[PDB]
Amino acid sequence: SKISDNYSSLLQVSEALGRAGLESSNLIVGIDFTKSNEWTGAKSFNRKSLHHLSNTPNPYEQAITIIGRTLAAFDEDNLIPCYGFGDASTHDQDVFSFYPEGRFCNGFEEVLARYREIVPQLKLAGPTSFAPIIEMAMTVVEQSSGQYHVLVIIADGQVTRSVDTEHGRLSPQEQKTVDAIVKASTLPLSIVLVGVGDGPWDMMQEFDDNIPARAFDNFQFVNFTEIMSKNKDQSRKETEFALSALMEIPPQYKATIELNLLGVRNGNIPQRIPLPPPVQ
Numbered sequence: 001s002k003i004s005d006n007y008s009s010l011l012q013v014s015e016a017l018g019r020a021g022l023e024s025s026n027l028i029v030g031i032d033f034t035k036s037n038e039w040t041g042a043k044s045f046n047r048k049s050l051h052h053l054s055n056t057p058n059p060y061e062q063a064i065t066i067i068g069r070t071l072a073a074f075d076e077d078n079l080i081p082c083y084g085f086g087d088a089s090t091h092d093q094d095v096f097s098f099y100p101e102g103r104f105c106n107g108f109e110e111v112l113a114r115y116r117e118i119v120p121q122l123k124l125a126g127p128t129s130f131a132p133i134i135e136m137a138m139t140v141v142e143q144s145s146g147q148y149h150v151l152v153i154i155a156d157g158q159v160t161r162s163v164d165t166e167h168g169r170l171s172p173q174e175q176k177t178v179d180a181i182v183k184a185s186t187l188p189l190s191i192v193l194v195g196v197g198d199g200p201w202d203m204m205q206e207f208d209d210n211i212p213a214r215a216f217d218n219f220q221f222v223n224f225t226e227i228m229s230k231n232k233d234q235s236r237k238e239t240e241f242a243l244s245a246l247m248e249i250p251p252q253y254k255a256t257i258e259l260n261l262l263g264v265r266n267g268n269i270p271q272r273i274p275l276p277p278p279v280q
């Protein structure tokens, strides 16, 4: 069933997590390194690459930063596995871990630092699929033996789609992504898409609201550009962000219990091996 925006404040969300008795959670981060990032900054990052490093922070650095300031409490041990996808070394088939022997980022300061160190060494490629990053998350959950996890994907939302194709027929990248979201709902996993750049967002919204085959609504879309573009205080922007990111988490947590996913090994999850970071 679909999960609406049931909470109008961060406070309501924390109470809702309180009533549901959330005691433990961990984060997983995935980062879109596809070529489309070079042109989805046309309006919102002044015709620059969304991954372009400079004196100003790019939307990815901004999103990492706010995630660290608003969501760090939801990773119980401050160690965050981070993965990249869609560069020339992974295309639409694989992900790579930020560090060689899969070692984790200690805190989101290191996530930000490691991102900065990695990105200019990457050939941004494609095609764009969320299938590998979601399948990587699935493997992290299955290996922890059903420990509750939130996958945060920071991306520009431009999954390789058909066009024009009226049809209702899906590109392989889109179909595999939907298949992964469906399969993911056999595990105690929440997905939050932090959308950066110009969009368009119709497809992310469809992942958010309309996938009939999945066991429960396991996917939330946060339009990061739209929240940051508001004429509000920085403190109010972070609250709006945290509220958007967490909106579906209490019902999703509860759903993992009602559907008997939490703490349970599914036994039917392919083990995805991350590639090493393609760097020096």
Ligand SMILES: [Ca+2]
Pocket: 026, 027, 075, 076, 077, 078, 079, 080, 081
């Ligand atoms: Ca962790």
Ligand SMILES: [Ca+2]
Pocket: 003, 207, 208, 209, 217, 218, 219, 220, 221, 248
């Ligand atoms: Ca949703």
Ligand SMILES: [Ca+2]
Pocket: 003, 004, 005, 208, 209, 219, 220, 221, 248
């Ligand atoms: Ca939603």
